């Protein structure tokens, strides 16, 4: 006999995933296999990092100027993190934001990925039975990260295509009211900026409306800016930290302490296996609580050392960002154009590793049953693994998310060809 | 406007140290740290190996680069190679008397993480776990903070070397019922922190039978299994199952779990390598999904799988580690008796459970706090008061010996002797 969490509290949407695993596509021996376009991973700039590693072997050698510091690292288990790394991190975060804002390293707490940061924040801001508002459509992983062990609930703030899925004052108010009706105390709004799965940076207008709503309701604002480094085209990416500055919110504003940021190196630098997440808050109480909670998911000191060396190289960071935006824009343009050669268009995006594509016109009907229908035809007949919009809780059937940053151009082309032949009927 | 969770000061000794740390050169009268359970005894063996085997830490596997491959590795089942090296090392520690299935092993970011995840998997909020007293003070945070689970003590006393008793178990179980807490299991540290003793076969059988009798779980935190430097032999709970003839047909066979970590034996706490081992498929699956909130860095998993795959190194590290640890413990134990102070006879760990009851102005905890302060402020040593570990009798202290140069240990022993005067 185990706990509720381990048993009856531990779907149709993994159909493409399992179908893919069973028949993975292969350039040579399985050219008709399923192509993976449902994995948000960035494999575009590993050459830049491999190159740097080759010219800078000391980092990964437990060294510092011909000096071994192995023993020192092996012993480092301070929940405040390696100072050098926290400094390099805060600088990198600033550089991503074009140095428009600066971060205090002491308000930054490292976690084993954003997955960890996501949950820890919830543990810090809400008790079981309370709720957090999240704009729809959203990262399906939130349904596990934010609620599994926290007992916290998610109330959706619905967005529709009528306005490019932007956040609305009416949607916010309505979501807040839906929570009250259910007798759930709203503790905050969690936003993904840039957005997964939309692929769009949040507008200043949306940000101001959020800040004012959060200020109005007296709740928190968590900005998951894990994709902040993948904004490859205008409009410019606006970090919530910038908006505070621009709305003239100094530490005298009450809201100034209710705005937090979540970040990670998994999506921009493509290092998900290294488990580097971070929490940033202006509230000392949250930093302290989150710092103690990070003990359940500390970042390997070996990794913290490697990355502090890497991220301390301003020549590399500056160049990685520029090269990463270049390669990502090129790639998105490719997918977007190949998609329209099939008559399919996408939500106009400027960030992320995926496109939110519009396939409503292919729906035999404007129902989610019709969307599941289309999705299956794509899985079984076109042999592509893509994500159905309903997976992300989209309110209108027919939208899909397709990734482009972890596929060789040749494969992307193949997928686009298969799509075109299929649409042909 | 935060959660209840976002809103135990024995850290006194800790603060004073940080403020006034002892130093060989500019602060010879500073406070000496003897309250930190860390093993700094064999880093030379590891540094040596790293030097002769540079490929491991180079994101290289047979002259080729696997950086991208590792950078992308985020499977919550862990790197297969590492899980194999780990299970072999665990077997080797237990003198190959038991073998572990790598698929029943789930990696976590330290034992701290493994501790909590196990609680999340075995008990719901408001339920309880029994823990023998005295115990690792960290349990009070790890097992209850975010889990809402409660700890009910199974008290042990010096009358029998702080061993577990059938009467203490029964009494603890009854204290839980009285409080209307549902007991879900017993958590044991074998070898023990802070006792420094390996659990006896007798204690183990009595635990197995009690747990079997009550129909609850048995979690054996064997994080110190590799530091058992003197007999009696260390007996892993996995061995006792084998010895009590418990195959997978026993119900209890699926209610026995182990927690392990590389932080105390190999001295790698910064790398965050913990592990959960269970025979129950349901726990492994749930724990595997929970590990996503605290996965082990793929860069680290790779380095250690290379290291632990070297049977020449593992075999030699264990032997050398037991050697250096026994030498060190003997030093502290003798220097302590030259002061008239004795310790609980131990054979494992990185610390000694020392008896200083005779120094108490009173057989009270206020007296123990009295003594402890005199030791902190006058003798300038940071040691842990037994009440921190929930010891039921005042006067016991835990002092570490594995992270102090012999010269410093000597200094500490000298200061103690002068004070005892
Ligand atoms: C990919 C992703 C995560 C997980 O990040 P890790 O650092 O791999 O744990 C969390 N949130 C969002 C929105 C993501 O896209
Ligand atoms: C030191 C210790 C821990 C913490 O180990 P980590 O691997 O650093 O998380 C857990 N339990 C006991 C009994 C310990 O002594």
Q: In chain A, what are the domain boundaries?
A: 1-56+314-423, 57-313
Ligand nearest to the CA of B225: 2
Which residues have C-beta within 8 Å of that of residue B318, sequence separation ≥ 6? B92, B93, B226
Whole-number Å distance between alpha carbons of B129 and B185: 5
- How many degrees, rounded to 5, is the angle at CA A142 between CA A156 and CA A286? 95
Sequence-ordered strand ranges (E) for A47-129: 108-112
Sign of CA dihedral B366, B368, B369, B371: positive
Task: Output the DSSP codes for B383-415.
Answer: -EEGGGGT-SSTTEEEEE-TTS-HHHHHHHHHH
Which one, of B260, B227, B231, lies nearest residue B349 by Cα? B227
CB B321 within 8 A of CB B226: yes
Catalytic site residue B317? no
* Phi and psi at residue B132, to the nearest 5°: -65, 140
Tokens at A338, concatenated: 């190949």
Using an 8 Å CB-CB cutoff, list chain A residues near B297.
273-275, 299-300, 302-303
- Chain length of chain B: 421
Helix, coil or strand: residue B246: coil
Instruction: Say if the Cβ atoms of A77 and B113 lie within 8 Å.
Output: no
**Alpha carbon distance A154, A130 (integer Å):** 9
| Lookup result for tokens 């909590």 | B116
| CATH class of the domain defined by A57-313 | alpha beta
Rounded CA-CA distance A37/A411 in Å is 10
For A280, the token pair is: 């940033």
- Strands A345-346 and A354-358 come out as antiparallel
**Given A96, A134, A226, A321, the catalytic residue:** A226
Ligand nearest to the CA of B39: 2
* DSSP bridge pairs for B187: B219
Q: Which two tokens stand for residue A214?
A: 């959060």
Looking at domain A1-56+314-423, its CATH architecture is: Alpha-Beta Complex (3.90)
Q: How far apart are CA B324 and CA B329, in angstroms?
A: 9
Report the CATH architecture of B1-53+311-421: Alpha-Beta Complex (3.90)
Using an 8 Å Cβ cutoff, are B133 and B121 in contact? no
What's the gap in Å between B130 CA and the centre of ligand 1? 37
Contact between A251 and A219 (Cβ < 8 Å): no
Domain B54-310 has CATH 3.10.129.10: no
Q: Annotate B304-364 with DSSP letters as a single string.
A: HHHHHH-HHHHHHHHHHHHHHHHHHHHHHHHHHHTTT-EE----SSSEEEEE-GGG-SSSS
DSSP type of residue B106: E
The kind and range of the H/E element at A142 are: helix A142-145
Overall size of chain A counted in residues: 425
B277 is catalytic: no
Q: Are the C-beta atoms of residues A380 and A14 closer than 8 Å to each other? A: no
Residue/partner pairs of A60-68 with CB below 8 Å, 24 or more apart: A60/A306, A60/B57, A60/B58, A60/B59, A60/B299, A61/B50, A61/B54, A61/B57, A61/B58, A62/A302, A62/A305, A62/B50, A62/B57, A68/B47
CA angle A98/A103/A108 to nearest 5° reads: 130
Euclidean distance between CA atoms A89 and A146, whole angstroms? 25
The Cα B59–Cα A59 span in angstroms is 12
Which contacts qualify for A326-332: CB closer than 8 Å, 24 or more apart?
A326/A232, A327/A44, A327/A45, A328/A42, A328/A44, A328/A230, A328/A232, A328/A353, A328/A405, A329/A232, A329/A233, A331/A44, A331/A404, A331/A405, A331/A409, A331/A412, A332/A199, A332/A232, A332/A404
Bridge partners (DSSP) listed for residue A221:
A189, A259
User: Which of B122, B272, B304, B405 to mutate: most A Cβ within 10 Å?
Assistant: B272
**Ordered DSSP codes for A224-263:** E-TTGGG--SSSPP--HHHHHHHTT--TTSSGGGSEEEEE
Alpha helices in A344-390 (DSSP H): 368-380
Contact B224, B193 (CB under 8 A): yes
Q: Whose CA is nearest to atom 5 of ligand 1?
A: A114
Locate A221 and state its tokens: 């604002």
User: Which residue blocks in A254-300 are alpha helix, DSSP H?
Assistant: 284-293
CA atoms lying within 13 Å on the CB side of residue B207: 29
Q: What gap in Å lies between CA B37 and CA B184, rounded to an integer?
A: 29
A226 is catalytic: yes
Structure tokens at B381: 């040593």
- CB-based contacts of A28: which residues, under 8 Å, 6+ apart? none
Q: How many CB pairs (< 8 A) connect A and B?
A: 193
CA gap B408, A121 in Å, rounded:
43
Task: Please say whether the beta carbons of A146 and B293 come within 8 A.
Answer: no
Instruction: Determine, for residues B43 and A119 on separate chains, whether the beta-carbon distance falls below 8 Å.
Output: no
């Amino acid at each position: 006999m185990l706990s509720r969490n381990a048993t009856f509290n531990s779907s149709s949407y993994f159909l493409g995933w399992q179908e893919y695993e069973k028949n993975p596509y292969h350039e040579v021996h399985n050219t008709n296999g399923i192509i993976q376009m449902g994995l948000a991973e960035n494999q575009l700039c590993f050459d830049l990092l491999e190159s740097w590693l080759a010219k800078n072997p000391e980092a990964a050698a437990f060294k510092k100027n011909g000096e071994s510091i192995f023993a020192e690292l092996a012993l480092f288990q301070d929940y405040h993190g390696l100072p050098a790394f926290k400094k390099a991190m805060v600088d990198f975060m600033a550089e991503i934001r074009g140095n428009k804002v600066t971060f205090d390293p002491n308000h930054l707490v490292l976690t084993a990925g954003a997955t960890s940061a996501n949950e820890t924040f919830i543990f810090c801001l809400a008790d079981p039975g309370e709720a957090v508002l999240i704009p729809t459509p959203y990262y399906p992983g939130f349904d596990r990260d934010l609620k599994w062990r926290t007992g916290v609930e998610i109330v959706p703030i619905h967005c529709t295509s009528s306005n490019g899925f932007q956040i609305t004052e009416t949607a916010l108010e309505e979501a807040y009211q839906e929570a009250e009706k259910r007798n759930l105390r709203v503790k905050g709004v969690l936003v993904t900026n840039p957005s997964n799965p939309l692929g769009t940076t949040m507008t200043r207008n949306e940000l101001y409306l959020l800040l004012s709503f959060v200020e109005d309701k007296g709740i928190h604002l968590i900005s998951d800016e894990i994709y902040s480094g993948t904004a490859f085209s205008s409009p410019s990416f606006i970090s919530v930290m910038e908006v505070l500055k621009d709305r003239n919110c100094d530490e005298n504003s009450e809201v100034w302490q209710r705005v937090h940021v979540v970040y990670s190196l998994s999506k921009d630098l493509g290092l998900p296996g290294f488990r580097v997440g971070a929490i940033y808050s202006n509230d000392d109480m949250v930093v302290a609580a989150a710092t103690k909670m990070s003990s359940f998911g500390l970042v390997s000191s070996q990794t913290q050392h490697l990355l502090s060396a890497m991220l301390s190289d301003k020549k590399l960071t500056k160049n990685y960002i520029a090269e990463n935006h270049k390669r990502l824009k090129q790639r998105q343009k490719k997918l977007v154009s190949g998609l329209q050669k099939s008559g399919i268009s996408c939500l106009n995006g400027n960030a992320g590793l995926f496109c939110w594509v519009d396939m409503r016109h292919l729906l035999r009907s404007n129902t989610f049953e019709a969307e599941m229908e289309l999705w299956k035809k794509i899985v079984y007949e076109v042999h592509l693994n893509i994500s159905p919009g309903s997976s992300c809780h989209c309110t209108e059937p027919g939208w899909f998310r397709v990734c482009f940053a972890n596929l060789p151009e040749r494969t992307l082309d193949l997928a686009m060809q298969r799509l075109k032949a299929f649409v042909g009927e």
